[PDB]
Amino acid sequence: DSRIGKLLGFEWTDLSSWRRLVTLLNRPTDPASLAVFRFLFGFLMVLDIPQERGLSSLDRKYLDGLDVCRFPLLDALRPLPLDWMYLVYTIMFLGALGMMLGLCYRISCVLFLLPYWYVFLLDKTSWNNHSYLYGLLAFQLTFMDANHYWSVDGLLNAHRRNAHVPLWNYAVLRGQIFIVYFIAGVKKLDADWVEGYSMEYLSRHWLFSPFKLLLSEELTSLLVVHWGGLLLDLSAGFLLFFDVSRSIGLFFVSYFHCMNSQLFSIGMFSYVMLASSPLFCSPEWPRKLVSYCPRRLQQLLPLKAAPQPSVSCVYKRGQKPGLRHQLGAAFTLLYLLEQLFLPYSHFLTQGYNNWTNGLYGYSWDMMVHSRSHQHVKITYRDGRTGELGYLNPGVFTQSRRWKDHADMLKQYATCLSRLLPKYNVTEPQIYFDIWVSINDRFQQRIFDPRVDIVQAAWSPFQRTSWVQPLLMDLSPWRAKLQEIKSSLDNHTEVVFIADFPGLHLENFVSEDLGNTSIQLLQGEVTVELVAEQKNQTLREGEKMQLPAGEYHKVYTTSPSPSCYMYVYVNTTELALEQDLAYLQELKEKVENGSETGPLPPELQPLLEGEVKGGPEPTPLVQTFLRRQQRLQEIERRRNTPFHERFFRFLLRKLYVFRRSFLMTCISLRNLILGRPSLEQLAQEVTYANLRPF
Amino acid sequence: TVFLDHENANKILNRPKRYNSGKLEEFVQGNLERECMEEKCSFEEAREVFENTERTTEFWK
Numbered sequence: 001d002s003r004i005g006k007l008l009g010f011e012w013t014d015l016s017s018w019r020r021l022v023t024l025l026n027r028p029t030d031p032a033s034l035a036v037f038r039f040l041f042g043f044l045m046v047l048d049i050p051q052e053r054g055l056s057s058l059d060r061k062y063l064d065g066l067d068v069c070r071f072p073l074l075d076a077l078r079p080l081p082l083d084w085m086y087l088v089y090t091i092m093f094l095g096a097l098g099m100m101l102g103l104c105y106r107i108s109c110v111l112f113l114l115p116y117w118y119v120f121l122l123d124k125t126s127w128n129n130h131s132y133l134y135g136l137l138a139f140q141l142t143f144m145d146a147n148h149y150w151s152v153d154g155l156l157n158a159h160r161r162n163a164h165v166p167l168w169n170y171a172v173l174r175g176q177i178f179i180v181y182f183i184a185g186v187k188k189l190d191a192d193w194v195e196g197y198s199m200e201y202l203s204r205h206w207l208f209s210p211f212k213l214l215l216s217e218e219l220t221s222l223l224v225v226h227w228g229g230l231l232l233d234l235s236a237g238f239l240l241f242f243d244v245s246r247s248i249g250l251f252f253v254s255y256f257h258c259m260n261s262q263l264f265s266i267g268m269f270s271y272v273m274l275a276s277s278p279l280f281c282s283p284e285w286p287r288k289l290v291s292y293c294p295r296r297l298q299q300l301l302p303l304k305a306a307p308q309p310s311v312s313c314v315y316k317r318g319q320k321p322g323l324r325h326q327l328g329a330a331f332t333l334l335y336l337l338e339q340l341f342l343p344y345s346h347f348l349t350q351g352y353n354n355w356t357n358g359l360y361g362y363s364w365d366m367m368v369h370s371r372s373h374q375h376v377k378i379t380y381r382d383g384r385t386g387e388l389g390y391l392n393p394g395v396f397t398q399s400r401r402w403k404d405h406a407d408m409l410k411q412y413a414t415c416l417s418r419l420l421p422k423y424n425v426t427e428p429q430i431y432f433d434i435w436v437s438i439n440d441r442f443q444q445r446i447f448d449p450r451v452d453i454v455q456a457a458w459s460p461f462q463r464t465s466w467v468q469p470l471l472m473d474l475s476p477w478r479a480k481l482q483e484i485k486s487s488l489d490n491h492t493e494v495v496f497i498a499d500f501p502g503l504h505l506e507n508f509v510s511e512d513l514g515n516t517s518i519q520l521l522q523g524e525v526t527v528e529l530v531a532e533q534k535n536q537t538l539r540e541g542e543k544m545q546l547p548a549g550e551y552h553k554v555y556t557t558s559p560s561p562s563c564y565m566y567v568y569v570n571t572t573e574l575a576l577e578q579d580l581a582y583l584q585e586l587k588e589k590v591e592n593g594s595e596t597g598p599l600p601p602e603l604q605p606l607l608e609g610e611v612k613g614g615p616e617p618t619p620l621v622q623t624f625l626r627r628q629q630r631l632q633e634i635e636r637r638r639n640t641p642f643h644e645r646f647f648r649f650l651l652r653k654l655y656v657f658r659r660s661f662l663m664t665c666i667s668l669r670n671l672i673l674g675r676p677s678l679e680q681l682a683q684e685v686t687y688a689n690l691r692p693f
Numbered sequence: 694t695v696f697l698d699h700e701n702a703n704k705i706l707n708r709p710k711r712y713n714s715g716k717l718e719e720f721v722q723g724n725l726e727r728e729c730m731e732e733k734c735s736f737e738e739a740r741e742v743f744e745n746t747e748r749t750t751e752f753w754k
C-alpha cells in the first residue's frame with residue numbers, strides 16, 4: 001500500500017536480505033509482452049540479414065584469391081572461404097526464423113548469437129551502435145524464457161504454454177533501453193552538440209518545414225535538433241517507467257523515431273527502438289487487448305486464459321530458492337553494472353584512444369562527431385636501393401575508417417608491408433600524411449609524417465606517441481572562419497590549414513587553377529618556391545600570389561602552430577563556363593528569331609541534336625549536349641509520381657532478396673555436392689543476377 | 694593504379710567532395726545517390742557521421 005511500493009513496484013524490505021532480493025527478482029509476471037517483442041525483433045533481424053549484414057554483397061567482399069586488408073579485432077581471426085561464410089549466414093537466418101516462431105528457442109538463439117558476434121568481430125569497419133545493440137539483445141534473449149506465449153514450442157510441449165516468467169526478464173531489457181537513452185543523452189553534454197555544430201545541416205530538411213513557420217532556420221537548427229535531442233534522450237530514459245508519464249513519453253518517442261527513420265538511413269534501428277518502447281507498458285497488455293475482440297477473431301489469436309504456474313519462479317504461500325533463481329539475479333546485476341561501466345572504460349584501453357574516445361560502436365555517441373578529410377599521402381622508401389615512391393590513398397582496402405584510428409593504420413601498414421613485394425619492392429618503410437578536421441575546424445595532421453608505421457610501437461593499453469594532439473586553442477576561430485566562407489563568390493574556394501612547428505607542407509598547384517593566393521591568419525611561416533629556390537617570410541595579414549603549375553612549400557618556424565588559408569579559383573572551369581554561356585546565348589538568339597543569318601556549321605549539330613552524316617562534334621558541343629541531356633534526365637526524375645517511386649523501391653528490394661537466396665543456394669550446392677562444370681557456374685551466376693522485371 | 698605519380702600525389706588543393714560527387718553521379722551504381730548527395734550535404738559529411746548503414750556499399754550497388 002506504500003506509495004514507494006506502488007510507484008517502483010517493490011518495498012524497501014525486499015532489499016533487506018539476499019533471499020528477499022532473489023524472491024523479488026524472481027516473482028511471477030505475465031509472459032505476453034516479451035513474446036510480442038521476441039516476434040518483432042526476430043522479424044526485423046530476418047529482414048535485416050539480407051540487407052545490412054551483407055548477404056547480397058558477400059560474393060564481392062570475401063572473394064577467394066583477392067588480396068585485401070582486413071581489420072579484425074584479433075589478428076588470430078581469419079575469414080573462411082566464401083561457401084562456408086554463406087553457410088554461416090544461412091545458420092544466422094535459420095536462428096532468426098526460429099527465434100521469430102519460437103521453435104527450439106534456445107538453439108535458435110545460440111545459432112543466431114555465435115555467428116553474429118563472429119561476423120561483428122571480423123571487421124572493425126562495420127561497427128555501429130545499432131549492430132552492437134542487436135548483438136546485446138540476442139545475447140540477453142538466449143537466457144530469457146520468451147517461448148512461453150505465442151510459440152510453436154508451446155504447442156509441441158504443453159508444460160511451457162502460457163506460463164509465468166521471472167521478473168528479471170523484463171528488468172534486464174528495461175535497464176538496457178534506459179542505459180541506451182541515458183548514456184546517449186549524457187554523452188551529448190559536449191561543447192560540439194550544445195553549440196549546434198554537429199549535424200548543423202539537418203534543419204533544411206522538408207520534415208522540419210512546419211517548425212520554420214514560427215522559428216528562423218538558425219534557431220531551429222539549435223533549439224529543436226540539438227537541445228530537443230538531449231532533452232528527449234533524458235525524457236525517454238525516465239518518463240516511460242512512471243505511470244502518469246507513459247502516454248506523453250510514448251507519443252514523443254514514437255514521433256522522434258519516425259522522424260529519425262525518415263531523416264536518416266540508419267536502417268532497422270528506429271523500428272527496433274519503436275518495438276522496444278511498448279516494453280515499459282504493463283506485462284499483460286496483449287492479453288487484455290485480445291480480450292477486447294469478438295469471438296471469431298479470438299478463435300485464431302493466442303489464448304486468453306489466465307497464465308498457469310511455472311517452475312522457474314518463487315511462489316509465496318515459503319519456497320526455498322534453487323540455483324537458477326539466484327543466478328538470474330546475479331546475472332541481472334552484473335550485466336547492468338557492466339553495461340554502465342563499458343562506455344567509460346576508455347581509461348583502461350588507451351591504445352585505441354584518439355582525438356575521439358575509443359573505437360566506434362559501444363559508447364552510444366550517435367551523430368556527435370563529423371569529419372572532413374582533405375588529403376591522404378602514402379610514401380614508401382625501398383629498403384634495398386633507397387628509392388622513394390608514392391602509393392594510391394586507398395589501395396587494397398574496402399573502407400575509409402583507417403584514416404582516424406592508430407590501430408587500423410598499423411594493421412594497414414603491416415598489410416602493405418607483406419603485400420608490396422609482389423610488385424618488385426623490397427622491405428619498405430611506410431609514412432602517412434593525413435589531413436582531417438572534426439566539427440569544422442582547421443585542417444591539421446592526425447599522424448606524425450616522419451614515423452615509420454611498420455616499425456612504430458603500439459600496444460592496446462599504452463598511449464601512442466605518433467598521434468598528434470587536437471588543437472582546441474584554435475576552436476574560437478570557428479566563428480571568424482565561417483564569415484570568410486560567406487564573403488566569397490560562386491567560383492572562389494577556400495581551404496584552411498593549421499600546421500605544427502617544424503613540419504612543412506609541400507603542394508603542387510595544378511595548371512588549371514590559376515589565380516591562387518596564400519594568406520597567413522596566425523603565426524609566422526616561410527613560403528618557398530622551388531623553381532628558383534626563393535622563399536619569403538610572411539607575417540600576419542600578408543598575402544602572396546603563388547605560381548600555378550609548379551611546386552611550393554610552406555615551413556612553420558614559430559614556437560607555436562601557424563594557421564593560414566589557400567584561396568583559389570579554377571580558371572579552366574571559369575573559361576569553360578563562360579564559353580558554354582556564350583554558346584547558350586547564341587543558341588537562344590537563333591531560336592527566338594534573332595541572328596537571321598545562316599548558322600555556323602558547328603552549330604548545326606546543336607540544333608539537330610544528333611551528329612549523323614557529318615563531322616564529329618567538338619568537345620564543347622559534346623559538353624553542351626551532355627549537360628542538356630543530364631538536365632532533362634534530372635527534370636524527368638524530379639517530376640515522377642509517388643506510386644512509380646514506391647513500385648521501383650519494392651522491385652529493387654525484391655531483386656536484393658532474390659539475389660541473396662539464389663547465391664546462397666548456389667553456394668550450398670557447391671559445398672555439398674561439389675563443383676559442376678565452369679560454364680554451368682557462369683550460366684547460374686548470370687541467372688541469379690538477372691533483374692526480376 | 695597501385696603506385697601514384699610524384700606530381701599527382703602532392704595535390705592538397707584537389708576537391709574531395711566535388712570529385713566524390715562527380716564520380717558517384719557518373720558511376721552507374723550512383724546517379725540517384727549522386728543526385729541525392731548533390732541535393733543533400735557533401736558525402737564527406739555522411740562518411741564523417743559514421744552511423745550510415747553501408748553508405749559506401751549502397752552507393753557502389
Ligand SMILES: C/C(=C\Cc1c(C)c(O)c2ccccc2c1O)CCC[C@H](C)CCC[C@H](C)CCCC(C)C
Pocket residue numbers: 180181184199224225226228229232233256259260264266269270273366367
Ligand atoms: C541526430 C540526433 C540524434 C542521434 C540519435 C539517433 C540518430 C538515434 O536513432 C537515436 C536512437 C535512440 C536514442 C538516441 C538516438 C540519437 O541520439 C538528434 C535528434 C533529431 C530529432 C529530429 C529531434 C526532434 C525533437 C522533437 C521534434 C521534439 C521537439 C520539442 C518541441 C520543439 C516540439
Ligand SMILES: *[C@@H]1O[C@H](CO)[C@@H](O[C@@H]2O[C@H](CO)[C@@H](O)[C@H](O)[C@H]2NC(C)=O)[C@H](O)[C@H]1NC(C)=O
Pocket residue numbers: 502503504526528533534535555556557
Ligand atoms: C627557405 O626558407 C626555409 C625556412 O626554414 C629554409 O629551410 C629549412 O631549410 C634548411 C636548408 O634546406 C634545412 O636544413 C632545414 O631543416 C629546413 N627547416 C625545416 C624546419 O625543415 C630553406 O632552406 C630556404 N630555402 C633555401 C633555398 O635556402
Ligand SMILES: *[C@@H]1O[C@H](CO)[C@@H](O[C@@H]2O[C@H](CO)[C@@H](O)[C@H](O)[C@H]2NC(C)=O)[C@H](O)[C@H]1NC(C)=O
Pocket residue numbers: 492515516517567568569
Ligand atoms: C583571384 O583572387 C581572388 C580570389 O583568389 C579574386 O579576386 C577578387 O577580385 C574582385 C575584383 O573586383 C574583388 O571584388 C574581390 O574582393 C576579390 N576577392 C578577394 C580579395 O577575396 C579573384 O577570384 C581572382 N582575382 C584576379 C584579379 O584574378
Ligand SMILES: *[C@@H]1O[C@H](CO)[C@@H](O[C@@H]2O[C@H](CO)[C@@H](O)[C@H](O)[C@H]2NC(C)=O)[C@H](O)[C@H]1NC(C)=O
Pocket residue numbers: 510511512513570572573576706707708712
Ligand atoms: C579544375 O576545374 C576543371 C574544370 O573542368 C576540372 O576538370 C575537368 O577535370 C576532370 C577531373 O576531375 C577531367 O576528367 C575533365 O576532363 C576536365 N574537364 C574538361 C577537360 O573539360 C578540374 O578537376 C578542376 N581541378 C583541377 C585540380 O584542375
Ligand SMILES: *[C@@H]1O[C@H](CO)[C@@H](O)[C@H](O)[C@H]1NC(C)=O
Pocket residue numbers: 422423424
Ligand atoms: C618488375 O615489376 C613488375 C611489377 O609487377 C613486374 O614486371 C615484375 O614483378 C618485375 N619484373 C622483373 C623482371 O623483375
